[PDB]
Design a binder for these strands. Structure first.
Lengths: 88, 88
DNA sequence: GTGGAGG
DNA sequence: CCTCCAC
DNA sequence: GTGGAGG
DNA sequence: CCTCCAC
């Protein structure tokens, strides 16, 4: 249902974890994200929060920013959504 | 050194607290913030995070968005900065 | 609705 | 003097 | 560096 | 078939 990568991120405060620690974000996507400016998981969380946690908006932003796909954005989203329900 | 309002916010996860719960943000500023879209403390945290926690950038964004002043932006900023060091 | 900082 | 938050 | 989903 | 993440 959820990747191990997911749980690891949802398990504890991201603090300074890199964006690549985000579920759905690997070396390729992660790389581009950093270049676009979002060079830290928390920065992506900021964008998530800014888009008021809206799934479509966020996932669509991701797809437009680093080029994630259906599974990628879905996982990254659900990942943050859960982290927030856990610590925010 | 820090207002009571501050501590209350830095004490626990903002969760769903309204923007008016933010140190430095009262009924006047808070109101405008909501209208500009940021209708929830966490949304402001998202903007803070997006601006990678930069003091000037954030405080300047605040001043430009709701019209906070020197003390207002300073407190709102220090407020979030601490919350993050405490839960992010 | 007083007190006090910011402007 | 007026604004706006903290209490 | 294999396995498997997304495109 | 190629891309890109999860492991």
């Amino acid at each position: 249902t959820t990747s191990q990568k997911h749980r690891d991120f949802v398990a504890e405060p991201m603090g300074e974890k890199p964006v690549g620690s985000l579920a759905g974000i690997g070396e390729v996507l992660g790389k581009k994200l950093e270049e676009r400016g979002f060079d830290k998981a928390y920065v992506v969380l900021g964008q998530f929060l800014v888009l008021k946690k809206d799934e479509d908006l966020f996932r669509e932003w991701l797809k437009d920013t680093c080029g994630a796909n259906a599974k990628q954005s879905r996982d990254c989203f659900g990942c943050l959504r859960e982290w927030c329900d856990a610590f925010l």
